[PDB]
Nucleic acid binder design. Structure first.
Lengths: 554, 253
RNA sequence: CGCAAGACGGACCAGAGCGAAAGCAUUUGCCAAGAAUGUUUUCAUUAAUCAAGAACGAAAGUCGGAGGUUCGAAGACGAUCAGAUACCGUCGUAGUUCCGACCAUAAACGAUGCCGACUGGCGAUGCGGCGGCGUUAUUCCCAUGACCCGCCGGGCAGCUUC
């Protein structure tokens, strides 16, 4: 009430007992409130209440008996109100209000150390608050619902982090802010096709042409912008644990929002296989996590091969469980000890970042399916020496050896179901699992590109089923109306040309192929060959192992 | 005990009835209440979520279900996995089955497991003033048919199959250790039921075989059952035929 | 059954605690003070005991005010006794209580000066700190609470012996 000296000193004497066993611990906040609502004067400021406001939203912190917990949502909203007000005071104004002298009024805090990281004590807060929201999105549970007002606080913290971004006098512009940017890209990165294509497929000539719509279309750019920008603002730190972290989040953006090409490029350039060894165990989880979404967007671009090799490394293991921080101590026998797996529970992970594992499973098992069913059709037409264990061969085998399967009622069984249909070589059986189990199962219902990936699945099935059919049937043939194959497997002649052309070249068939006449003339024998080539092999295997038995001996 | 424990499970059943309706009329309409466009944060979690009714029915119904299940498990089970007389057990089993059918299905695995364990303890236990097995087909046949019908329909209801298999195995074991008596009714019943439930899953071969078996049973039951109906014979012959002509060879890929 | 006055803090209350000694028990708040323990903080011999001199010092008593229920020197009675100015019963003044000045004494006794070093064993108790197989409180979970076991300080005491 009298010149900002009694006031300041009582500030001192309240921000002193800050820690000890006698805290009251909530009526320090209260008493900071009783030097503000009874702070009703003038110039002096609006002005220097800002900083007190820090300290006091810092009361709006420290009440809390420790770091593991989560923050009564009323406390959460009070926090917000504080921070929000302490954007008010710190747009309008610009003087920087724990230093830069003016005329005076009315300080002194040059005299302690630097105006400026106590100026930079607003980014601190807001990062803290990000983290507190994160601690939220762990203790609330899960499929159901307190949940939505909490999602709404999440909206609002989106707000906050946005705000904490445009402002930046920092020391001016570029050269460290980058971490606001970091937070902001951590709340841009795991978002969606629909908001990378509200710019592109909410119609771009049907949408408003208003500066605001450009700020929307630029808003989709603004994260992949801060890549290009704030590399140098980090660009500048070589620290492997932030480098290997950041780029993994960047490769995410590409494959989903845009080209899978750029995604494929970026990891292949970086070579972060070596670098994760230098990195600490959160970034291990990011490495695994990024590998998921690339084998996903392999299957979405429609490439069986790359989706296989990508999702292979995960499906060699059953650790995606413990990697997403979900693992029990006993869920086979392996996963001891108690106090150490809790580290994962404390560090990992919000529910809104997860993916379905049955998706991941099925997407892997289906990619391999189109590769391996022609492969084994070829093999059991006596091309066998290429039979490889510990692969989809095995994963199909364990489901194959059920004496008792009727209709499939598990996603495994729907894969087994479509597999049997592919063996028989009827398109029909593919469509069963691709429609029905994808509605069960909601493997279908998680992509706007399921529309695309339908067509990608279908024509491949129709081509490889034709191929599995041909691997058996071609002994029986004397010739073929190639026109029939086009009509029957629902393909067209230009493609069926190119297919049968590729086939007879590279599968090394004894067909002669009249492409203008649309005729094949084959006559490749013999059914007794299945025995004869088999004992010819059984024979030939004799001398070859025998030379090792020689070369050992000598 | 009969009056008390029946009145207990009856009070718990009504709390769950009220708990669902409550959540499924007031709170379910509160959920999808109003529009249904843009959730602000409902679309983002649409990549790995479900509907709002399951999302908030878990808040106000799951309790009832869980409670009931636990009670049924520890009730008769953890208080009457055997003993001497007193059926009520059949009623309890029926209730459990109904619950499994309606609410969660996983309960089946637990319930089934417990039942099997209990049957093993006795059948392979015999050591207490319990039931003096010998020629008491009453309780025997009772429990038998009970579990049977319960198991059969149960599996052939929630799209289960392993459960049905376990049930059949158990029945077979009972017949093995319960083949000392000639044979009462229900036999034909169960036979027909099984053949039917089969039909598809397995080939109409083994299914048709079971059908013919039931047809033969209709002969014995006839001489003993006495069924003056031509339509019946017709239907029988029809079922026989079909189950027969259907597949001439299996594709052992 | 209600009201008033003054006095007084039971059982709980203990070879228990605090204070230099005299002493100190109903609730709650305020005011200043102190011991022990913890500390890889500070100072660097600043200490020990004491003529002169100084503070506090039960009860009774004295002086001036307030108060005066209860008990009660003195005193008046009733008994007991040869006698009975006593022990016992009734009444009762000063005093007993509070405020302000005096008085300096007690079996003010552990009848045992103060400071320092060394020399047996054992089980407890009050306070602080530290270590631990566990039960127990709550919010579901190492906040700090209670109970159990052990260790290290200093304190009131006890038991045991060539």
């Amino acid at each position: 009430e009298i010149t900002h000296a009694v006031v300041i000193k009582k500030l001192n004497e309240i921000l002193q007992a800050r820690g000890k066993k006698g805290t009251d611990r909530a009526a320090q906040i209260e008493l900071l409130q009783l030097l503000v609502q009874i702070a009703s004067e003038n110039n002096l400021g609006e002005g220097v209440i800002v900083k007190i406001k820090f300290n006091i939203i810092a009361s709006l912190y420290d009440y809390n008996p420790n770091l593991a917990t989560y923050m009564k949502p009323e406390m959460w909203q009070k926090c917000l109100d504080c921070i929000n007000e302490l954007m008010d005071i710190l747009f309008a104004n610009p003087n920087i209000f724990v230093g830069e002298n003016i005329l005076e009024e009315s300080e002194n805090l040059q005299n302690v150390d630097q105006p400026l990281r106590v100026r930079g004590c607003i980014l601190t807060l807001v990062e803290r608050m990000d983290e507190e929201f994160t601690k939220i999105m762990q203790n609330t549970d899960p499929h159901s619902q307190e949940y939505v007002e909490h999602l709404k606080d999440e909206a609002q913290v989106c707000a906050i982090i946005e705000r904490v971004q445009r402002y930046l006098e920092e020391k001016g512009t570029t050269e460290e802010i980058c971490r606001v940017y970091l937070r902001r890209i951590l709340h841009t990165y795991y978002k969606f096709d629909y908001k990378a294509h509200q710019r592109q497929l909410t119609p771009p000539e049907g949408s408003s042409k208003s500066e605001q719509d450009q700020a929307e279309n630029e808003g989709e750019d603004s994260a992949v912008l801060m890549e290009r920008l704030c590399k140098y603002i980090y660009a500048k730190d070589r620290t492997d644990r932030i480098r290997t972290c950041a780029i993994l989040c960047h490769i995410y953006h590409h494959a989903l929002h845009s080209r899978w090409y750029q995604a494929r490029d970026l990891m292949l350039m970086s070579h972060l296989q070596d670098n994760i060894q230098h990195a600490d165990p959160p970034v291990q989880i990011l490495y695994n996590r990024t590998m998921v979404q690339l084998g996903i967007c392999a299957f979405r671009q429609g490439l069986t091969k790359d989706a296989h090799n990508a999702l292979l490394d995960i499906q060699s293991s059953g650790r995606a469980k413990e990697l997403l921080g979900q693992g029990l101590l006993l869920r086979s026998l392996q996963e001891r000890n108690q106090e150490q797996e809790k580290v994962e529970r404390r560090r990992q992970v919000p529910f809104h970042l997860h993916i379905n594992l049955e998706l991941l499973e099925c997407v892997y098992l289906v990619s391999a399916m189109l590769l391996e069913i022609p492969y084994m059709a070829a093999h059991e037409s006596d091309a066998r020496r290429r039979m490889i264990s510990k692969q989809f061969h095995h994963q199909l085998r364990v489901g194959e050896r059920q004496p008792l399967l009727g209709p499939p009622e598990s996603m495994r069984e729907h894969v087994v179901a479509a597999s049997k249909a592919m063996k028989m070589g009827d398109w029909k059986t593919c469509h069963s699992f691709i429609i029905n189990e994808k509605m069960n199962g909601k493997v279908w219902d998680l992509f706007p590109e399921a529309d695309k990936v339908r067509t990608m699945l279908v024509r491949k099935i129709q081509e490889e089923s034709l191929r599995t059919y041909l691997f058996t049937y071609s002994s029986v043939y004397d010739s073929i109306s190639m026109e029939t194959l086009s009509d029957m497997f629902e393909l067209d002649l230009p493609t069926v040309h190119s297919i049968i052309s590729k086939m007879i070249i590279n599968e090394e068939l004894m067909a002669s192929l009249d492409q203008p006449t649309q005729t094949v003339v084959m006559h490749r024998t013999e059914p007794t060959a299945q025995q004869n080539l088999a004992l010819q092999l059984a024979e030939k295997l004799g001398s070859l192992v025998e030379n090792n038995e020689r070369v050992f001996d000598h | 005990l009969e009056d008390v424990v029946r009145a207990y499970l009856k009070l718990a059943e009504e709390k769950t009835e009220a708990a669902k309706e409550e959540s499924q009329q007031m709170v379910l309409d509160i959920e999808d209440l109003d529009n249904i466009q843009t959730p602000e944060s409902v679309l983002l979690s649409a990549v790995s979520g479900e509907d709002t009714q399951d999302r908030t029915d878990r808040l106000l119904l799951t309790p009832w279900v869980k409670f009931l299940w636990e009670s049924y498990r520890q009730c008769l089970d953890l208080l009457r996995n055997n003993s001497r007389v007193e059926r009520l057990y059949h009623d309890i089993a029926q209730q459990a089955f109904k619950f499994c059918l309606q609410y969660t299905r996983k309960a089946e695995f637990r319930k089934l497991c417990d039942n099997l364990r209990m049957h093993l303890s006795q059948i392979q236990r015999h050591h207490n003033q319990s039931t003096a097995i010998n020629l008491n087909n009453p309780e025997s046949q009772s429990m038998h048919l009970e579990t049977r019908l319960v198991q059969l329909d149960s599996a052939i209801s929630m799209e289960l199959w392993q459960e049905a298999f376990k049930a059949v195995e158990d029945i077979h074991g009972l017949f093995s250790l319960s083949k000392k008596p000639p044979k009462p009714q229900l036999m034909a019943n169960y036979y027909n039921k099984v053949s039917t439930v089969f039909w598809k899953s397995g080939n109409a071969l083994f299914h048709a075989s079971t059908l013919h078996r039931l047809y033969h049973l209709s002969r014995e039951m006839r001489k003993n059952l006495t069924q003056d109906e031509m339509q019946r014979m017709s239907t029988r012959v029809l079922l026989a035929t079909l189950s027969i002509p259907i597949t001439p060879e299996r594709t052992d890929i």
